[PDB]
Structures are given as structure tokens and as C-alpha cells.
Write a protein that binds this ligand. Sequence first.
Ligand SMILES: *[C@@H]1O[C@H](CO)[C@@H](O[C@@H]2O[C@H](CO)[C@@H](O[C@@H]3O[C@H](CO)[C@@H](O)[C@H](O[C@H]4O[C@H](CO)[C@@H](O)[C@H](O)[C@@H]4O)[C@@H]3O)[C@H](O)[C@H]2NC(C)=O)[C@H](O)[C@H]1NC(C)=O
Ligand SMILES: *[C@@H]1O[C@H](CO)[C@@H](O[C@@H]2O[C@H](CO)[C@@H](O[C@@H]3O[C@H](CO)[C@@H](O)[C@H](O[C@H]4O[C@H](CO)[C@@H](O)[C@H](O)[C@@H]4O)[C@@H]3O)[C@H](O)[C@H]2NC(C)=O)[C@H](O)[C@H]1NC(C)=O
Ligand SMILES: *[C@@H]1O[C@H](CO)[C@@H](O)[C@H](O)[C@H]1NC(C)=O
Lengths: 42, 71, 71, 218, 204, 51, 51
Amino acid sequence: WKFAACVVDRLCLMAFSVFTIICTIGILMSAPNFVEAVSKDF
Amino acid sequence: IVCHTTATSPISAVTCPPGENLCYRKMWCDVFCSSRGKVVELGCAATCPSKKPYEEVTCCSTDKCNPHPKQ
Amino acid sequence: IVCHTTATSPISAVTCPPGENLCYRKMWCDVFCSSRGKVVELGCAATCPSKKPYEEVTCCSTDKCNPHPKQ
Amino acid sequence: HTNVLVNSSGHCQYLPPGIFKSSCYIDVRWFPFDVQHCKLKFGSWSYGGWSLDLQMQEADISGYIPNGEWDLVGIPGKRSERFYECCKEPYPDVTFTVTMRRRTLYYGLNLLIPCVLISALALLVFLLPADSGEKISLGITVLLSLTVFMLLVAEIMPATSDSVPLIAQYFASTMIIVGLSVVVTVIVLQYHHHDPDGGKMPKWTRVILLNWCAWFLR
Amino acid sequence: IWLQMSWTDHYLQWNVSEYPGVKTVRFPDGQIWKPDILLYNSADERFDATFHTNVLVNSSGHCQYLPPGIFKSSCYIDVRWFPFDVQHCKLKFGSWSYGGWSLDLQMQEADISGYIPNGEWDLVGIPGKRSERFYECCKEPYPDVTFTVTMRRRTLYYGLNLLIPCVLISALALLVFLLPADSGEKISLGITVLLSLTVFMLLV
Amino acid sequence: AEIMPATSDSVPLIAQYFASTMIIVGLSVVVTVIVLQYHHHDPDGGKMPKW
Amino acid sequence: HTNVLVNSSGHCQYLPPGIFKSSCYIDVRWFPFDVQHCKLKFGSWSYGGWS
Ligand SMILES: *[C@@H]1O[C@H](CO)[C@@H](O[C@@H]2O[C@H](CO)[C@@H](O[C@@H]3O[C@H](CO)[C@@H](O)[C@H](O[C@H]4O[C@H](CO)[C@@H](O)[C@H](O)[C@@H]4O)[C@@H]3O)[C@H](O)[C@H]2NC(C)=O)[C@H](O)[C@H]1NC(C)=O
Ligand SMILES: *[C@@H]1O[C@H](CO)[C@@H](O[C@@H]2O[C@H](CO)[C@@H](O[C@@H]3O[C@H](CO)[C@@H](O)[C@H](O[C@H]4O[C@H](CO)[C@@H](O)[C@H](O)[C@@H]4O)[C@@H]3O)[C@H](O)[C@H]2NC(C)=O)[C@H](O)[C@H]1NC(C)=O
Ligand SMILES: *[C@@H]1O[C@H](CO)[C@@H](O)[C@H](O)[C@H]1NC(C)=O
């Protein structure tokens, strides 16, 4: 039981990792002037 | 097609570009509708545009069918 | 090299120190550019400085090439 | 109301300074990456163009003082005219359109770094072994920290119902992700704590999971 | 709002032919008569929120007056159906010392060509009604003009900033039951969820 | 937050101070999770690396 | 300061509206079950009862 639970836990960890990175990137790359705002401020 | 317009002062008789064969005019009351009267916007458009609740439109398809009310 | 300057009132004909052989003047409109006109800054600099968007510069390399416009 | 200065020809010159408040529609849909075009419309109140011929000369920025939250793109002007039914005479006006873009160096590293760190820590729960009774502790504490972060977030955002600001969606996505992480760890925790004599694991799930694990861990 | 008063002055009349080019004149506040129209239900702390512009007169004597202002009026708000609530807040205008036999008010219609939506209220309408009130002293009636601003709230903010977190918190609270007791985390989860709700009460 | 300025023209010092503190604390959490993964382990299941 | 209205007999009628702030002692001992008696005292500033 425990090995199955650990590996499914790791699989879930993955799915959330990919979902999270893709979500943050897409939402902060959607803004029309976002690319210009970082080049100026940073 | 020749349509009167208001973007040129004095009021002109500009000759409309192609694709737009409807002279139109749009009139509504602003604050100064007691002394000055209703506003006037003249032009030529592809098809005559939407009439808001407070706006009136009188759309023609002939030359100089949309003059200032004085005329 | 002798360059006019404005840091001295009345307008002087101060003689510039070494290393700076370009008399310059810089002129722009402030608020009072309707009655007073544009501002005037005269001096001598190493090489004539940067022109901002709203500033104009007329840079010379000769004696008394940057006088007040009246003169 | 300052004084009016007159020279021998009669030319008169008038500078009323002031702190002016004008009405301009703000769009916070792309917050904080948003550019605003707020205009200022000047005109006479009782005079027409045949009695007061307004002439627009250009605006002055020699005295501009940057404030640290908005960058001034420009302030161009436009003279416009409006005709009325009463007569042929036109009524002029002068409109100056202040264009400005927000500066993100503050929100970037005071609203989006803590959120990213919190989300990462929330994802961190899965690595944690179940033997340590700390997975639920970590996940729920992270959610509580996010709840606290919402206070700063609220005091810093706009309250508009005309659109959804970007970072509102960002924080909603983060919240949903954290909550579903809590749910999933509860599930697998249900698996870890189980009595073999009481029940048996399903077949299909077992074999699929075992094959995927064996391939992933080589 | 910008008010709009229009009346006729008998004493401010002239012949255009005798004054070529002078088609209008303008008079400041205290140089000619203006009516005492003002908001009965004002809560401003100066009671007249208007900016006294100039009065414009043409040869017939027709006079035209626009006092703009930021007006604060008293209106009962009902928050029983918050945030799904519609408010009917009215503005009552009338003379202060004149009757209907000395100042015959006439209500013409309101103007929305300049309306600027604000993002928290949707304007249903602003209809007007002229009404009259009689008194024991005499048969003469006292008129008034009432404009009823009707507006409904916009829920896109409270919907997904006050009701999504609450639903997620409640779901997580229900989640405790699935959790096995062997894991010493059921009380932890439940009480932490209650604490998160307590914090949410601050925004709320 | 209530005590600092909200400016995007520059980064106040203590903002960097608090950022560094936050990063340090978070990485401490990560590292303790790692070594915790080590402490709770089944010997029959796996072997520790050599190097 | 509104205007004063006068009829042929000389009777004069005056309505100054306003947002008035007055001093009144509040007792919060029985909060929130508390009743307050806040008073407003009006009188002339330079005239007596014989004037
Ligand atoms: C001093 O100012 C006053 C008011 O500004 C002015 O009296 C007003 O003049 C206007 C314009 O002549 C009058 O409006 C007219 O009213 C009649 C009757 O209601 C209408 O039939 C007229 O119709 C015109 O406008 C229509 C708009 O759609 C057109 O479709 C139509 O073809 C006509 O062109 C017009 O609306 C107004 O009634 C008077 N009075 C008042 C109280 O407004 C007066 O003439 C000015 N004096 C001088 C010396 O200039
Ligand atoms: C009372 O005040 C008015 C206004 O202050 C004044 O009339 C103005 O005088 C100025 C200066 O003479 C005028 O500006 C000139 O305009 C002409 C035509 O546009 C220009 O060619 C002139 O060029 C000068 O400035 C240039 C700036 O770069 C120089 O490069 C050039 O060499 C010239 O020196 C100059 O700009 C202005 O047009 C008038 N009128 C107005 C409305 O400003 C009037 O003279 C004063 N009366 C008395 C009795 O003093
Ligand atoms: C004054 O107006 C009348 C019409 O009302 C006109 O006959 C007369 O000519 C006008 N005055 C002059 C100086 O013409």
C-alpha cells in the first residue's frame, strides 16, 4: 500500500508542478505591455 | 458620392472615399440643448451606424442629403 | 578661449579655464515663454552637452560665439 | 486667480496654477501591466468660435517631476469643434490626453514573489513522507499564510466589477491549486493509513500505477 | 451633475439692429436675478454644492444657467439582499420661497449623453416627476421636481473574492471526515480551517 | 507594509533585507524536508548513494 | 445663510439649514445596550429677555 501511495503522491506532485508553472507563465505573459514593463523597470 | 462632414470647419462638402455610399447625420441634446440646440455630426459611413437611446439618425444614400438644418 | 556666461549677473565675458574650449548656449521654453521668451544658459564646457527633447543647443569653438540674442 | 500682466500693445498673459481633479475611465483588466489615457477637456463656457477663437499651442514638460508609480508617455493636444442646430457657428475645445504606464517594480517583488514561494511550499507537501504527521500541517498552514497574504493583496488592488484584474486570476489559480493539493494529500493519506485485513486495493489502478512507477523510477 | 435652468427676463431685452454684433451678454451671480432652486434633501455641509457660473442672455431675454456641482443627497439604502440589491435614490429640487403662481416650474427630461460608468453600479434610469403640494394658508400650489436615480450593484467582485474562498474553506472543513483517525491531523485541519475563516472575516 | 513606501523607482534596503530573510527561511523548509525524506526511509526498499 | 421672506404685515421667516456638530457626553458603560441624551442649546449671543 505504502509504495503505491508514495509513487502516486510523486505523480500528483508532478501534475501540479507542470500545471503551476504553465499557469503562472501564461497569465504573466498574457498582459499586452508585460514584456515592455520588465525591460524598463528591471 | 459626396457627403457633408463636420470634421472640417467650416462645414465642407468633402467627397467620400469608396466603400462608403451612405451620408449620415447624428443629433442629440447635450447640456446646452436649451440655447445652442442639439448636436450635429455629419459624415459618410459604410452602413449607417447604431442609434443609441439618446441619439437620432437620418440616413440617406444621395449626394448632399445631410446638410446642416439652416440649409 | 573666452565664453559668455550667465552665472554672473550682469552677463559677463568670463575667460574660460583650460580643458574647455567650446562655448555653448542652451535654450528652452519654460512656463513664461509667452511674454519672457525662452530661457538662456551660457557657458563653456569640455564638449558641448546632451540636448534633451525640449532643449536646443548652438555650440561654437570661437571667442564670444554665444552672446545673448539682443547682441 | 493670479494677476494679469499687460504690455503697451495690450498683450495679456495669464497663469492660473492649480491642483485639478478630472474624470477619466480607468481600465484595470491588465493590472499591473496597464496603460491609461486620461484626458483633460478645456473650453469656453458661454462663447462660440466667432467670439472666442481658441488656438491650441503645445504643452510644457520642462517642469515635470516623476512620482514613482507612473511613467509619462506623453501629453498631446487636439483642437476640436462642435456644431449645433441653432446656427452655422462652431464651438471649439482643446483636449490634452495624458498617457501613462504603470511601474511594476513594486508589485513584481512584493506581491508575486511571496505568492510564488507560497505556491512552491504548497507543492512541497507531496515529497514529505506520510510517516511524518506533518503533510496536513504544512498544507493547511500554507493555505493560512495565503489567506493572510490576501490582506495585503486586497489593500493594494482595485475593487471593480467591470472586469477581472490579472493578478486576481493569478491568486485564484494559486488558491485552487493549494486547495486541491490539500485534497490529494488527504486522499493518499487515506491510502497510507489502512488496515489490510479490513480491505483490498483495486486491481486496475494498482497495475497501472505499478507500471508507471517502474518505468518512471527505472 | 449639471443643472439646467432656463427662464425669460423682461428687462434684459434689446434690438440687434441697434447693437450690431452683440447677440449675447453674460452676467455674474449677483448682478441679475436667479431662481432659488436648490436641493431639499442635501447633506453637503455647505448645502449648495453648486459652482456659480455666469448667466447668458440673448436679445429676447431668454436666460440660460448651468451650475455644475458634486451633490450629496440623503437616500435610504436597503442592504437586505446584499450584494444582489437595487437602490432607488431620489433628488428633490424646488424653490425655497416661491409658489406656483410666482415660479411655475416645468420639468423637462434628464441627460445621460455624458454618463461615465464607474464599475460598481449599473444605471437603470433616472426618470423625473413634477409634483405639487397644497397648504392651509391658500389655494396656490407649491411645485417640485424629483429625479429618481435607479441603480443595481455589480457582483463580479464579491462573487469571486468573497464567495469562492468561503466555499473552498467550507469544502476543506468537510474534508476532515475522510481523513483517517490514525493520522493525528483531523483536529489540526478542522481548527486551522476555522482559523482561516476567522481571518477571512477581516476582509468580510 | 504599513510602515514602508510604495515606490517603483528603486528598491528600499529593508525590502531586500526582508526578501533575503524570506528566501532563507523558505530554503530552510525545503532542506529540512529533504533530510526528513532521508530519516523516514525503509532499508529493504532502497540504498543510500556511495559518493 | 438663505434669504429672509417678508409679507405685508412684516412677519419674517428664516430657515438656515446645516450639518451641526455639538458636544455631548457619551456613556459607553452599558455598551452596546446604551441610551444617550445629547442636547443642543440655542440662545442669543448678545441680547437679553427684555430685548
Ligand atoms: C433666444 O433664445 C431662445 C432659446 O434659445 C430662442 O427661442 C427658441 O428658439 C428655438 C429655435 O428657433 C425654438 O425651437 C423651435 O421650437 C419650435 C416649436 O417647438 C420647433 O417647431 C422648431 O423645430 C426646429 O427644430 C427641429 C428639431 O428637430 C427641426 O426638426 C425643425 O425642422 C425646426 O428646425 C424649433 O425646435 C424654441 O422653441 C424657442 N424657445 C425656447 C423657449 O426655446 C430665441 O429665438 C432666441 N432669440 C433670438 C433673438 O435669437
Ligand atoms: C507685448 O508682448 C507681445 C508678446 O509677448 C509682443 O509680441 C510678440 O513679440 C515676440 C518678440 O518680438 C514675437 O516673437 C517673434 O515672432 C516672429 C514671427 O513668428 C519670429 O520671427 C521672431 O523670431 C525671433 O525669435 C526666434 C526664436 O528662435 C529667433 O531665432 C529669431 O532670431 C528672432 O529673434 C520672434 O519669435 C511674437 O510673435 C509677438 N507676438 C506674440 C503674440 O507673441 C509685443 O511686441 C509686446 N509689445 C511691446 C510694445 O513690447
Ligand atoms: C428695432 O426693432 C424694430 C422691430 O422690432 C425695427 O423696426 C427697428 O428698425 C429696430 N431698430 C433699428 C435702429 O432699426
